[PDB]
From Swiss-Prot:
Residue ranges of coiled coil: none
Record's subcellular location: Cytoplasm; Cytoplasm, Cytoskeleton
Protein name: Dynamin-3
Gene this chain is encoded by: DNM3
Entry function: Microtubule-associated force-producing protein involved in producing microtubule bundles and able to bind and hydrolyze GTP. Most probably involved in vesicular trafficking processes, in particular endocytosis.
Residues where GTP binds: 33-41
Organism annotation: Homo sapiens
Family in the record: Belongs to the TRAFAC class dynamin-like GTPase superfamily. Dynamin/Fzo/YdjA family.
């Protein structure tokens, strides 16, 4: 169809910021894998940049909603970082 993924992204974003995500958990993809499965590398190969935390033991302690949008430019933005544009993906991991 046309504009389904970006539309639901807006819905997810709208549901994300006003914490009432109990109504949510609506259709979307959830990533499940062992610590040794290397699921982090798969995601990093999608973006084409390293931006996920690395360290001994589990580093991901919060559910990460990763919304990928095709664009000519390359940057990232956090909802809790209103208006700020990240161009350094090494800064992105540190922010997470």
């Amino acid at each position: 169809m046309e504009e389904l993924i970006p539309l639901v992204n807006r819905l997810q974003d709208a549901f994300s910021a006003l914490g009432q995500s109990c109504l949510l958990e609506l259709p979307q993809i959830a990533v499940v894998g062992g610590q040794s499965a290397g699921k982090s590398s798969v995601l990093e190969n999608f973006v084409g940049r390293d931006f996920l935390p690395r360290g001994s033991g589990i580093v991901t302690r919060r559910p990460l909603v990763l919304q990928l949008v095709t664009s000519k430019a390359e940057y990232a933005e956090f909802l809790h970082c209103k208006g700020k544009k990240f161009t350094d993906f090494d800064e992105v991991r540190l922010e997470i």
